[PDB]
Design an enzyme around this catalytic site. Structure first.
Site, PDB file in Angstrom:
ATOM      1  N   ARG A   1       5.083  -5.147  -9.197  1.00 45.81           N
ATOM      2  CA  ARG A   1       6.293  -4.498  -8.725  1.00 45.81           C
ATOM      3  C   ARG A   1       7.233  -5.487  -8.024  1.00 45.81           C
ATOM      4  O   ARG A   1       8.450  -5.417  -8.196  1.00 45.81           O
ATOM      5  CB  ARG A   1       5.932  -3.346  -7.786  1.00 45.81           C
ATOM      6  CG  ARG A   1       5.230  -2.166  -8.510  1.00 45.81           C
ATOM      7  CD  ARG A   1       4.546  -1.169  -7.591  1.00 45.81           C
ATOM      8  NE  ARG A   1       3.291  -1.721  -7.087  1.00 45.81           N
ATOM      9  CZ  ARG A   1       2.416  -1.067  -6.340  1.00 45.81           C
ATOM     10  NH1 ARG A   1       2.652   0.183  -5.953  1.00 45.81           N
ATOM     11  NH2 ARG A   1       1.300  -1.685  -5.969  1.00 45.81           N
ATOM     12  N   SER A   2       6.669  -6.403  -7.234  1.00 48.20           N
ATOM     13  CA  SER A   2       7.456  -7.438  -6.588  1.00 48.20           C
ATOM     14  C   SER A   2       8.182  -8.303  -7.624  1.00 48.20           C
ATOM     15  O   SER A   2       9.357  -8.654  -7.437  1.00 48.20           O
ATOM     16  CB  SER A   2       6.555  -8.304  -5.696  1.00 48.20           C
ATOM     17  OG  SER A   2       5.973  -7.532  -4.652  1.00 48.20           O
TER      18      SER A   2
ATOM     19  N   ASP B   1       1.323   1.774  -8.533  1.00 47.03           N
ATOM     20  CA  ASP B   1       0.701   0.540  -9.015  1.00 47.03           C
ATOM     21  C   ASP B   1       0.527   0.567 -10.546  1.00 47.03           C
ATOM     22  O   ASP B   1       0.117   1.593 -11.138  1.00 47.03           O
ATOM     23  CB  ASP B   1      -0.628   0.256  -8.307  1.00 47.03           C
ATOM     24  CG  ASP B   1      -1.658   1.317  -8.558  1.00 47.03           C
ATOM     25  OD1 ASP B   1      -2.735   0.981  -9.147  1.00 47.03           O
ATOM     26  OD2 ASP B   1      -1.465   2.512  -8.208  1.00 47.03           O
TER      27      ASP B   1
ATOM     28  N   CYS C   1       4.241  -6.067  -2.721  1.00 44.76           N
ATOM     29  CA  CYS C   1       3.619  -4.821  -3.094  1.00 44.76           C
ATOM     30  C   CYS C   1       2.173  -4.981  -2.624  1.00 44.76           C
ATOM     31  O   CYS C   1       1.961  -5.333  -1.454  1.00 44.76           O
ATOM     32  CB  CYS C   1       3.808  -4.527  -4.589  1.00 44.76           C
ATOM     33  SG  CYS C   1       3.678  -5.968  -5.664  1.00 44.76           S
TER      34      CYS C   1
ATOM     35  N   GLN D   1       3.392  -7.151 -14.265  1.00 49.31           N
ATOM     36  CA  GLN D   1       1.999  -6.919 -14.639  1.00 49.31           C
ATOM     37  C   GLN D   1       1.744  -6.077 -15.894  1.00 49.31           C
ATOM     38  O   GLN D   1       0.619  -6.036 -16.381  1.00 49.31           O
ATOM     39  CB  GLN D   1       1.285  -6.293 -13.444  1.00 49.31           C
ATOM     40  CG  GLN D   1       0.910  -7.328 -12.416  1.00 49.31           C
ATOM     41  CD  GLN D   1      -0.224  -8.170 -12.909  1.00 49.31           C
ATOM     42  OE1 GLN D   1      -1.328  -7.641 -13.136  1.00 49.31           O
ATOM     43  NE2 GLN D   1       0.040  -9.461 -13.159  1.00 49.31           N
TER      44      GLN D   1
HETATM   45  C1  T1D Z   1      -2.702  -2.073  -6.888  1.00 48.26           C
HETATM   46  O1  T1D Z   1      -1.922  -3.132  -7.466  1.00 48.26           O
HETATM   47  C2  T1D Z   1      -2.480  -4.246  -8.026  1.00 48.26           C
HETATM   48  C3  T1D Z   1      -3.854  -4.504  -7.912  1.00 48.26           C
HETATM   49  C4  T1D Z   1      -4.396  -5.647  -8.503  1.00 48.26           C
HETATM   50  C5  T1D Z   1      -3.577  -6.549  -9.203  1.00 48.26           C
HETATM   51  C6  T1D Z   1      -4.189  -7.671  -9.781  1.00 48.26           C
HETATM   52  C7  T1D Z   1      -5.388  -8.181  -9.252  1.00 48.26           C
HETATM   53  C8  T1D Z   1      -6.007  -9.274  -9.870  1.00 48.26           C
HETATM   54  C9  T1D Z   1      -5.446  -9.874 -11.020  1.00 48.26           C
HETATM   55  C10 T1D Z   1      -4.256  -9.367 -11.542  1.00 48.26           C
HETATM   56  C11 T1D Z   1      -3.641  -8.260 -10.933  1.00 48.26           C
HETATM   57  C12 T1D Z   1      -2.195  -6.267  -9.327  1.00 48.26           C
HETATM   58  C13 T1D Z   1      -1.648  -5.120  -8.728  1.00 48.26           C
HETATM   59  N1  T1D Z   1      -0.272  -4.773  -8.813  1.00 48.26           N
HETATM   60  C14 T1D Z   1       0.169  -3.843  -9.849  1.00 48.26           C
HETATM   61  C15 T1D Z   1       1.659  -3.697  -9.595  1.00 48.26           C
HETATM   62  O2  T1D Z   1       2.354  -2.995 -10.297  1.00 48.26           O
HETATM   63  N2  T1D Z   1       2.082  -4.416  -8.551  1.00 48.26           N
HETATM   64  S1  T1D Z   1       0.877  -5.207  -7.857  1.00 48.26           S
HETATM   65  O3  T1D Z   1       1.061  -6.743  -7.872  1.00 48.26           O
HETATM   66  O4  T1D Z   1       0.578  -4.665  -6.422  1.00 48.26           O
END
Ligand code: T1D
Ligand code: CL
Ligand code: CL
Ligand code: CL
Ligand code: NA
Length: 294
Positions: A218-219, A178, A212, A259
């Site tokens: 990642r998606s 992540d 993800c 992200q």
């Molecule tokens: C553990 O992964 C995540 C947790 C929270 C957020 C997130 C939550 C709220 C606002 C913005 C991002 C985003 C992620 N991601 C990081 C990532 O690299 N892919 S993800 O979409 O699963």
């Protein structure tokens, strides 16, 4: 290719953060009214990650946190969704069924950093199928092929109402952290091409489901790379692809795609390297296989 020239200039001037933040400032903003309704609170993993109304996937309460990224020019679609929750595993497989998807691409682990970022939504043993009573679906593990950093599963999804059966392929990248990036361009592309080679991105099937944890970072990285490679593939012209413009196009369909700045940087690397294959280098896929250490 212009993307390679631009990558060199961003590296030299150390400005990935500013470039990435400019994309966020320019990214589309659309309403997420349905996602924010009180009755859908417990259907969202993250309070601030929602599907826009205009591009969301409707179940046939019709709400799921999933978006159709419909890439008109590239002629490829993806459904990006969050990792299913304990109460939405039924909804997830319902969507797979209704959208006629043949592949699910999972780019996360169920546990990350001590926390449960995705439900255990598929069966881990052949003799322990899963029945989703709410959506009247049955899911059976048929087989699995485990490699050092990803696993491919053959699943059988049965609509119990009609007794129709479909084969779903599950592509699980297990070492993509992540907020992080894959080990190399080679690992990523080896994985991407495994998905491509399965037939799961064919236009004869419904859109591949990609997720993800939130279904954006990642998606987003996965889909951006795939689309950019497809665009240069259709034109046979690497130089014609503008990565930031394609990413901004994708962000019209779902918020927050890619992200971090380094995920954006990695996307350039993957696309520049994938370009070698697209344009007719037939030894590079085996190089990627070897370098990935699968
Ligand atoms: C553990 O992964 C995540 C947790 C929270 C957020 C997130 C939550 C709220 C606002 C913005 C991002 C985003 C992620 N991601 C990081 C990532 O690299 N892919 S993800 O979409 O699963
Ligand atoms: Cl896992
Ligand atoms: Cl952990
Ligand atoms: Cl969960
Ligand atoms: Na529309």
């Amino acid at each position: 290719m212009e993307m390679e020239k631009e990558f060199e200039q961003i590296d030299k001037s150390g400005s990935w953060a500013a470039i990435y933040q400019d994309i966020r400032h320019e990214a589309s903003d659309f309403p997420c009214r349905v996602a924010k309704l009180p009755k859908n609170k417990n259907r969202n993993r993250y309070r601030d990650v929602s599907p826009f109304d205009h591009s969301r996937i409707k179940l046939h309460n019709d709400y799921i946190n999933a978006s159709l990224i419909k890439m008109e020019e590239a002629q490829r679609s993806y459904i990006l969704t969050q990792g299913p929750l304990p109460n939405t595993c039924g909804h997830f497989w319902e969507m797979v069924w209704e959208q006629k998807s043949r592949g699910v691409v999972m780019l996360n682990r169920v546990m990350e950093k001590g926390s449960l970022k995705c439900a255990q939504y598929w069966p881990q043993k052949e003799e322990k199928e899963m029945i989703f009573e709410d959506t009247n679906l049955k899911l059976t593990l048929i087989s699995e092929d485990i490699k050092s950093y990803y696993t491919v599963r053959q699943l059988e999804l049965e609509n119990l109402t009609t007794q129709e059966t479909r084969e779903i392929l599950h592509f699980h990248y297990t070492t993509w952290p992540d907020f992080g990036v894959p080990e190399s361009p080679a690992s990523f592309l080896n994985f991407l091409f495994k998905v491509r080679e399965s037939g799961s991105l064919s236009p004869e099937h419904g859109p591949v489901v990609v997720h993800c944890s939130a279904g954006i970072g990642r998606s987003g990285t996965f889909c951006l790379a795939d689309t950019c490679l497809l665009l240069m593939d259709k034109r046979k012209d690497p130089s014609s692809v503008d990565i930031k413009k394609v990413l901004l196009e994708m962000r019209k369909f779902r918020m927050g795609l890619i992200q971090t700045a380094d995920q954006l940087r990695f996307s350039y690397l993957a696309v520049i390297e994938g370009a070698k294959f697209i344009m007719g280098d037939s030894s590079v896929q085996d190089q990627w296989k070897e370098l990935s250490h699968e």
